[PDB]
Amino acid sequence: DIPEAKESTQKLMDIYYTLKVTADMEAAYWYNRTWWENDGEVIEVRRAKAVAASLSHMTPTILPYEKLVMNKTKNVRGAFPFPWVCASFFNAQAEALMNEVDAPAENEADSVSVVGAGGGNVTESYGNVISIAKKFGMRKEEIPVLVKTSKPWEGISVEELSNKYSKMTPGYDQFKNIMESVICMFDSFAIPQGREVINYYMPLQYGFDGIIKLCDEKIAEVMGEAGDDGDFGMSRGYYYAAMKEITKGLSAWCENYSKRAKYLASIETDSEIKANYEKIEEVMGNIAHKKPANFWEAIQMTLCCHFGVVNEDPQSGLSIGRLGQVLQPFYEKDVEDGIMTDEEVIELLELYRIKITCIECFASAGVSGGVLSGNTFNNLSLGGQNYDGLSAVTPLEYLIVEAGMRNQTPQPTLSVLYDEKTPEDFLMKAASCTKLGLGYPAWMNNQTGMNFMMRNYGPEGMDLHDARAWCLGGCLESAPGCFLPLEYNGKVTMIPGGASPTCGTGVHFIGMPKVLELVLTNGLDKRTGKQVYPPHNKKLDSYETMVNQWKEYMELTTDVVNRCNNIQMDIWRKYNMPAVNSLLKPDCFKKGKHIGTMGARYNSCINFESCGTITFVNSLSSIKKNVFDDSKFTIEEMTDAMLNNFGFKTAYETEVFSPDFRESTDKSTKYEKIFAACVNAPKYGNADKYADEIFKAYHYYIYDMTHKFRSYYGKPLYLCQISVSTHGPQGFVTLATADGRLAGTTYSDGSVSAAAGTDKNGIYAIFESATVYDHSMHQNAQMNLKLHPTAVKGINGTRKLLDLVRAYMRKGGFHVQFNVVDSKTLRDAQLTPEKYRELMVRVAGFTQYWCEIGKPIQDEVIYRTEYDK
Amino acid sequence: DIPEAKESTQKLMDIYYTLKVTADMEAAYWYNRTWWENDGEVIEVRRAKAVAASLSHMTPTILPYEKLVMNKTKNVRGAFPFPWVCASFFNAQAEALMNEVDAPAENEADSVSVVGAGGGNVTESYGNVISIAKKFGMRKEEIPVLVKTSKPWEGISVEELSNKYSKMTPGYDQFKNIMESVICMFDSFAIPQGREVINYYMPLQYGFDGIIKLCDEKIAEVMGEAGDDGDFGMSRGYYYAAMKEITKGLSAWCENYSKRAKYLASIETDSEIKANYEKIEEVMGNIAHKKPANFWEAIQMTLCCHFGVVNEDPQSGLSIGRLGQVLQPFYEKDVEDGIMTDEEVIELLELYRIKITCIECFASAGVSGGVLSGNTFNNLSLGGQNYDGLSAVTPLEYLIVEAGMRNQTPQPTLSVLYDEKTPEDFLMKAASCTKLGLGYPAWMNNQTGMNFMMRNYGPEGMDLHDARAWCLGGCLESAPGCFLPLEYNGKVTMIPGGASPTCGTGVHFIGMPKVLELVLTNGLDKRTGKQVYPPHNKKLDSYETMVNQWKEYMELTTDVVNRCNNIQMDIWRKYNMPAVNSLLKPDCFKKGKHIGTMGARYNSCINFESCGTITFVNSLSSIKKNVFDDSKFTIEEMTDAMLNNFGFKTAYETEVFSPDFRESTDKSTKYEKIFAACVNAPKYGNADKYADEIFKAYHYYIYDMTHKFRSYYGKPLYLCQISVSTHGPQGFVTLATADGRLAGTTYSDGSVSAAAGTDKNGIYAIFESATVYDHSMHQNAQMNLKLHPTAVKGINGTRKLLDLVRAYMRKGGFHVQFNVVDSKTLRDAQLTPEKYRELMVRVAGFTQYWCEIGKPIQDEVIYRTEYDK
Amino acid sequence: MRHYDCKNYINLDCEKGLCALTKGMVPIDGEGSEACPNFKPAEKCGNCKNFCNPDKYGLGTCTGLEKENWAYATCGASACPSYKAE
Amino acid sequence: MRHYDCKNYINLDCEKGLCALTKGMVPIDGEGSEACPNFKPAEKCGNCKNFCNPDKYGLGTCTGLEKENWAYATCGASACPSYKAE
Ligand code: SF4
Ligand code: SF4
Ligand code: SF4
Numbered sequence A, B: 001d002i003p004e005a006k007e008s009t010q011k012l013m014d015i016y017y018t019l020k021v022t023a024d025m026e027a028a029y030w031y032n033r034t035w036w037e038n039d040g041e042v043i044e045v046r047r048a049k050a051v052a053a054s055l056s057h058m059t060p061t062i063l064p065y066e067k068l069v070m071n072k073t074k075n076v077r078g079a080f081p082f083p084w085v086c087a088s089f090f091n092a093q094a095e096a097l098m099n100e101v102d103a104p105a106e107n108e109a110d111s112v113s114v115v116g117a118g119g120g121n122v123t124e125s126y127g128n129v130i131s132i133a134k135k136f137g138m139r140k141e142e143i144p145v146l147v148k149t150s151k152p153w154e155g156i157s158v159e160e161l162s163n164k165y166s167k168m169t170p171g172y173d174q175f176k177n178i179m180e181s182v183i184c185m186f187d188s189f190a191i192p193q194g195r196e197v198i199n200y201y202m203p204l205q206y207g208f209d210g211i212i213k214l215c216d217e218k219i220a221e222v223m224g225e226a227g228d229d230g231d232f233g234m235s236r237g238y239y240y241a242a243m244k245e246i247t248k249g250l251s252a253w254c255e256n257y258s259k260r261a262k263y264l265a266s267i268e269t270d271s272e273i274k275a276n277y278e279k280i281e282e283v284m285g286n287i288a289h290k291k292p293a294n295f296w297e298a299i300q301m302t303l304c305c306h307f308g309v310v311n312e313d314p315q316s317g318l319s320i321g322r323l324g325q326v327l328q329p330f331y332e333k334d335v336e337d338g339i340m341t342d343e344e345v346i347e348l349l350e351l352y353r354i355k356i357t358c359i360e361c362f363a364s365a366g367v368s369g370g371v372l373s374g375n376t377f378n379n380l381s382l383g384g385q386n387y388d389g390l391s392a393v394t395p396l397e398y399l400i401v402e403a404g405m406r407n408q409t410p411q412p413t414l415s416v417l418y419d420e421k422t423p424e425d426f427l428m429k430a431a432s433c434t435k436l437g438l439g440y441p442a443w444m445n446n447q448t449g450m451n452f453m454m455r456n457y458g459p460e461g462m463d464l465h466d467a468r469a470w471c472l473g474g475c476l477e478s479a480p481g482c483f484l485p486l487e488y489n490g491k492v493t494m495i496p497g498g499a500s501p502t503c504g505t506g507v508h509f510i511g512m513p514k515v516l517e518l519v520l521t522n523g524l525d526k527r528t529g530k531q532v533y534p535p536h537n538k539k540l541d542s543y544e545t546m547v548n549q550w551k552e553y554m555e556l557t558t559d560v561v562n563r564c565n566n567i568q569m570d571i572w573r574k575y576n577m578p579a580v581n582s583l584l585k586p587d588c589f590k591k592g593k594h595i596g597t598m599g600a601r602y603n604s605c606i607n608f609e610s611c612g613t614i615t616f617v618n619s620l621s622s623i624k625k626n627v628f629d630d631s632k633f634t635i636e637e638m639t640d641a642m643l644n645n646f647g648f649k650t651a652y653e654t655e656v657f658s659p660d661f662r663e664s665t666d667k668s669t670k671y672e673k674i675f676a677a678c679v680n681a682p683k684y685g686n687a688d689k690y691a692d693e694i695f696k697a698y699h700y701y702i703y704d705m706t707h708k709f710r711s712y713y714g715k716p717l718y719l720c721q722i723s724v725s726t727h728g729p730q731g732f733v734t735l736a737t738a739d740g741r742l743a744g745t746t747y748s749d750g751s752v753s754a755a756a757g758t759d760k761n762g763i764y765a766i767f768e769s770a771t772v773y774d775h776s777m778h779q780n781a782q783m784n785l786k787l788h789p790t791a792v793k794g795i796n797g798t799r800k801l802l803d804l805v806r807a808y809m810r811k812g813g814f815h816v817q818f819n820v821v822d823s824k825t826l827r828d829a830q831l832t833p834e835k836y837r838e839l840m841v842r843v844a845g846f847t848q849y850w851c852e853i854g855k856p857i858q859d860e861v862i863y864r865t866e867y868d869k
Numbered sequence C, D: 001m002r003h004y005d006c007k008n009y010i011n012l013d014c015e016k017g018l019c020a021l022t023k024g025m026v027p028i029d030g031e032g033s034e035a036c037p038n039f040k041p042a043e044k045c046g047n048c049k050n051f052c053n054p055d056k057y058g059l060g061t062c063t064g065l066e067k068e069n070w071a072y073a074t075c076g077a078s079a080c081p082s083y084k085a086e
């Protein structure tokens, strides 16, 4: 039996479910004010001071019952805009509001993206509240503040400045067509940090006073000295001055919370609650200055770091990383020295889940809805191998899983770094949680991930020790880490933490089926009537000619997006470099270089993101067999059949975004034969060598393709292959595909998941298809499986599930995560969301409340093949 | 006999002599406005756009009779302030003026520096003209523009922003003390470009349209691409964008002169003067766009470049370089094709001297009067070796010497790169000019300079070819160059041009005798009462102890100034990098890096400036002889005698700044014996091994000392040893020295010149003393010699003079330059300056009008040993 | 006058909050948004001595610093170093 | 009304210039400084359509670009690309 959540947790969760996602202006106001007030200051320091003020001048909110405190804003599910990064997705709305004219139409990507209208989402303005970006409720009276705060950034936001230089690239117009058609989902400037792993070492090891001292020492050492380094020698000094500024910022911010706690204590009559507010006062007053001296302080300090970074840029996927290992030394002392019981630690961990669950990413709807479905992917990885190459599993990690069992929330998602060295009891513990159908833990291949680390980051000197410290940035963005020696409790513990900037930035989701579509339609987007690529005017006379034309458009797409996104990120790293993260991320502090100037240890992190791999492979398979091999149909017939949606109503009309519903029309029978050939062509995920060979060929191609390109860090791109929610928006903009998938409906989910309803040879066949290539060639590979709750009943159920995972893991499979749900419950909840407020499902690398998931992804999830055993 | 100057030249000089040095606001207004209008623009482009606007929005001025045109400003002897670099030396004056209160006291450096009140200098406000920085006349109505233009720069000019970070160095207070005592003459930010050689290659080879085309091509190639360079790869794109902008600026600027020339032509009733105007309109309209197609256009294009660069920063010593070689291809084609005669070429070259002579450096009085005596050191070097290691002397260079004979002006100073390969007739031609007593040509050792180049720049790959392209930055600041292939007239000519940034920046003039003083006075400046160095409290029990304490104080001084001046130049190179010079200077364009990011080919240019070397060595000789060897006096006796000025009245009372007087106060008999021992102790410059050994030891110590320090470019410092006028202000702050030199009086001039009236063994003994070390160990060594006119009578006397130069050069001596004058003449001009408006003397690396030289330097020049034959 | 303006107000979201004293949920607008007798004013720019001349939208001037800047009346001020109650 | 205001004025220094026509040296201030009948106004911000609202010191507003800025009346304008004679 899963014990009940703690009383504190229940009370806060009761409050949580009522909350609206809220955007306010304090942080943005204060960042802006301080930024311009320091105009002409050295950039690093100006940036540090503006971030510091945006934190330390905010209203600090503490709720009763809370033990762990802090939030992004004064609101609980709060966020604020970053007009200095980007603003176009809201600044025209806000000015239109101020002018009392109709709000501008959304851009294409935003318009084709759905924010789930339930739960806490504010998808429509109401009362005194404005829906910003189809998701965030902002009080009307702050609209003028939003406008005034955004105005100084015209032409000079990362977005707008980078746009200017992107216009000077030869492929600019081509790039714009790619964005407008949503072939590429979004811009790197939208979330310039994230899909990485934070590193909590510095403040856990030194505390803030200690860090300032370190900065003072470095400043005395290097200010005005270049050494032999004419490039960055002089910059070291400014880096430490900047770090000193942001550290003072974090300190003061903590003190504000301490003060709020002090006040709440003073008006609290409940003896128990008052003692608690006073504990918070002490905790926050302590971590404002001192090295953490207990588990509560330590985890609270990681929260401060985490909110610090997610408040300095719009971002998602700032992973917590391996918290159970990082905090093990603090945990173990407390349970050894009579400070805490395991139950009390469990309480903080349950409560911790609330904090992480409430983290919101303010960004365009294309991002928050089209991509994230609101989840902010603060991924917490478990297990793996420690510095010394032994199992890394800690007692605290069992407790983290326990807390995720008792307090079922979307975040943090838990990711087991599955490794043969992992004790069976922890595997079973994690499996027993996965079986609940909360979506977590997900299971990722420690070994394959380390292999990718060694491969990709080998040129930067990646070794076995650093490779072992890796874990997932965001959902599955395998991200460098390293271990650092934490002195605590009379000993030194090598603890993990991230060691790169963003590993999910560069060329963002390219809808590969849509590119294939435009091969077949001669560069014309038949959905919109706009010419996206110059017409190739090649007769598609063979499979190879078609494929080669696809590659050509793929390479062109990649080139022009890459160049613009380099400019986007380069502008950001030069005029908007991280402050908090540049303090935290090794080796910034050691080298006196911030993340913008390659202070991070590993910078081969920028990448290319695919989307709809299986829809694509399956479409190639159909075209090749039906058109070119069997010569049963002509390419023209195939294309015409695609353009007419095989004679069915389009999701543009039906609003069903899966194969679940298929409404015939007059043209239905005209196409019935080619449709059947399309549906029946070999599909990936069946251990069918015909489809699987195409899938294999694609993987070798895409590896070779991506590595031809260079990021702004001067490193080769590599393949990131997840879907997140992006198969929604991009599926939407794609007409029917040769694999029988109909127009406007979702791409396949993940990257090695079977396309919906095409897996007819069992789970192991999916495993077999997925692993015809070495997953370590790329950053990742994302599999979703859906089980009926009966298939995993009881401890033997638990073990059966674990054995399923191990079977795949052992083949080299990078990742598998499970829904354990009766899909009829989902269909039901879609009908009456008010009845299932707490219902969560796994989508792709994240768990979200069903009611906050837009219909396209719901339909998609509902339709995933359900396995009853 | 010397042919008389052309009519144009004569008329323009008539106008010249009446002109006032004038500061106005146009360029500054425009730079400021454009800078802030582009707030948020990538720095390189923002900077280039601002410089572009400050040039191309100025009022262009053309005078009647001019053939060559352009000036820094609308005024003839014009300049403007750069409050974004530094403003403290005027902004408090300006604001006092607006508030109608007393102008505040000058700082110490400025206060001890004299601007010659005569000539064109405006050292006192009069009528509607305000004297700015005791030299520049600014109309009263522009003061309010000055104030408003300077205000945005508070806290953020290079000056003030660098001061903030300097305040964070451990040695700041020490540094402050050093500046305040004028132990270090001035701050590097004062003149962050200069003491270098401009490179005219790009515009001469391509023209501005051609350069814009190259930029467009590079932009298309690299915008958005980093290559494998995560540091500067992305920055290439912004560099080319910046260069396009500045190039458009230079083009529009030329168009403005064309438009003005066109107007003046339209109202010119004198057909002859109308013809000039129309030639100017054509020339300027042509070089606005086209590759220069004749000599006139080509020399005019060098002016455009030269003015462009001296207008983008406050600076002195932007050397013209080897114009006679750069322009030889354009010259010879015009003479060949009968487009010009030599006499017409000589006219342009005569008129050119006026243009260069009128270049003003707006900076604090400490710089303009204390160091420059108003000269701006646009040094034109002659001869040396060409790319192929043969004599570089061109027929055009003879004409340049001729022009300097017919039109006697302070600028450009001419510098013969004396080399054994130089034809005798050119050597004789040069000497016949030198013997005139104009001070030019000076004679510098091509071989010694090339050796220094190979030594100092070896680590950067300096080869024989680039070494041969070297010449003098500023007065004597040996600066790297290279040859680039100019195609013209169907042939390719390897023309020289500068290849480094500033070679006269870093640790500026350190008054070495003053540092010695403070060794003797235990760190306390007895002139001011201020404790400058931490008292050492060492009993000066031996020569070695005293010298070691001097070294210790010298290293501390070097250390703290270096750290602060690094910050100064680093802030400058990051927020204020060259636009025009970054276009021109190789290899910026080739690498896509500006000067700030080490685009220049050679960056080991930053250095340490000594001052008062001989005063210092002679003082050590005296102390060692009189105190420690002969023990005839105690160190307390010596110190007391110095502190009491040997009983003589001080220059602070008498305003005689040479040994020329000694108002023999009663109390002198008290010191008469020690004073005679001091005067009589061995003196440098007499081939006296006692003094010369100390001199030699100083050189090996100082080499070793300087190279322990690193510039902001991460390169070791080296020694630059010139005096310019600095021996004036630094002599002023130095009390009597142990060599018998009295308080407040000038140090020895130059660096290997004999101290005033101490050379008693002939010029050759000076040559011998000077060359007891290898001059290529440092950048330079500066010697002045004064000959009585009768000493070089006749062609025989020309040969005698040349032979005197060859004797010194052949010993390896780096430099000699001559006054040829009767000192009585100078004493006379001092009594009545109004009577000698055109009188010029050689001071140190420059020639200047007597009437614009302050009394201290006048006194010093008068007293220099006058040689009879 | 409203809970939302009270120091004892615990922010929650764009529409509602908690009363610290009761731990009960309270609205920002509409019925039940009126402050009680226990009301104590929360520090905001709108009630700072340094704040002045707000326009119709609450956008005023902050004189908390030598150079004046803009501020907004509803901006939380409990954490502003320069705040001083009017 | 002064040589200094004339298009035919050739700048020299803070006190004087030349008349392009006579080629004679003329004063900026005082006796002998008034414009002659051959006067043609030199282009200056002071006589530009985009220049407005000077203060006592001649410091005014340039509206030449969408975003207003400050300018000065005696600033030479023959080379400003936005100058428009009033
Ligand atoms: S006004 Fe009263 S009920 Fe409302 S928040 Fe304040 S103390 Fe609570
Ligand atoms: S001093 Fe602070 S609280 Fe007061 S108006 Fe200014 S920003 Fe607001
Ligand atoms: S034309 Fe007349 S007003 Fe103009 S500068 Fe000449 S004399 Fe003066």
Ligand code: SF4
Binding pocket: D044, D045, D046, D048, D049, D050, D051, D061, D062, D063, D064, D065, D071, D075, D076, D077, D080, D081, D082, D083, D084
């Ligand atoms: S547009 Fe040009 S000339 Fe006219 S007022 Fe503005 S800056 Fe002056």
